[PDB]
Ligand SMILES: [Cs+]
Ligand SMILES: [Cs+]
C-alpha cells in the first residue's frame with residue numbers, strides 16, 4: 001500500500017525578454033532563447049496504513065526529479081508523516097502551505113523554472129511555499145474544509161533555536177475551502193508575525209542574504225471558481241501585506257501588494273485551451289506605491305490530453321512587469337509533454 005507516483009514533464013520553452021536595463025540590443029529585446037526545459041518533474045513515494053480506528057498513518061516522500069538531471073535530494077517536495085482520521089488529517093514535514101495548495105486553483109500552467117513567471121502565474125504564486133510544519137486539514141463538511149498549518153519558530157530558525165534572540169519566524173497558515181457542485185470558494189492565507197522577504201516579495205529564510213525582515217506579514221488569497229462541465233474558470237484575489245521590520249526609518253511602514261489572477265479554461269474534447277490574465281497591483285513598499293511590483297500577464301495555451309495521465313502542452317506567455325520607464329516584458333511560449341504516474 002506504498003505507491004510510486006510522479007509527473008514527468010518537460011518541453012521546449014522559447015523565451016524573450018524586453019528589458020531596457022538588461023538588454024541594449026534593438027529596443028531592449030533579448031535574443032530569443034530556445035531550451036529543452038524540465039517543467040518540474042517529480043517522483044514520489046507515499047503510503048497509507050489503516051490503523052484501524054478509522055485512522056491511517058500516511059506518509060509521502062516527494063522529490064524534485066527534473067529529467068534534466070537538475071535535482072538531487074529526497075523530501076524536497078511535499079513530504080510528511082501524518083495521521084488521518086475522521087478528526088481530519090494531521091501532517092508534519094515538508095508540507096505545502098495552505099496557500100501553496102490553494103495555488104492549484106490559481107496556476108495551471110506548466111513550465112520550466114525560467115518561464116515560471118511568464119508561462120505560468122509565478123508572481124501570484126510567490127506566496128506559495130513548502131514549509132516544514134505541522135498541518136491540520138479538517139474533514140470536509142457541507143462543502144467546507146479548512147486547513148490550519150503551523151511552522152514552529154525553531155523550525156523557521158534552527159540556528160536560533162536555543163536562544164530566542166531573533167524574533168519568531170513562526171508562521172500560521174490557514175485555509176477555508178468551499179467546493180460545491182463544481183464551484184470552489186477558497187480562502188487561503190498565511191500569517192507570520194515576523195517574516196522575511198526578498199525583493200521579489202517571496203518569503204525567504206531569516207539570515208538569507210539580502211532578505212528584508214517584515215512583521216505582521218500576511219497573505220490573503222481568495223480563489224473562487226467553477227470547475228466542472230468542462231469549464232474551468234478561477235478568479236483569484238491575493239492581498240499580501242506586511243509592516244517592514246528592517247531596523248530603520250521605514251520600520252513599521254506598510255508593504256502591500258494586491259494580486260488578482262483569473263483563469264478561464266474550456267475543454268473541447270481532448271484539447272483544453274486556457275488563458276489566464278494575471279495582474280499584480282502597484283505595490284506599497286515602505287508605504288509607497290511602487291509600480292515595479294506591478295505586472296500584467298496573459299497566458300494563452302492549451303492542453304492536448306492524449307490520456308488522463310499524458311498531456312501535450314502549448315502555451316504562450318506575455319508578461320509586462322513594472323511601469324513603462326523600467327519595464328520588463330517577458331514573452332515565452334512552450335510546447336510540452338507531461339506524463340503523470
Ligand atoms: Cs504548475
Ligand atoms: Cs527570464
Ligand SMILES: [Cs+]
Pocket residue numbers: 125126127128129
Ligand atoms: Cs512559489
Ligand SMILES: [Cs+]
Pocket residue numbers: 129130131132
Ligand atoms: Cs521554505
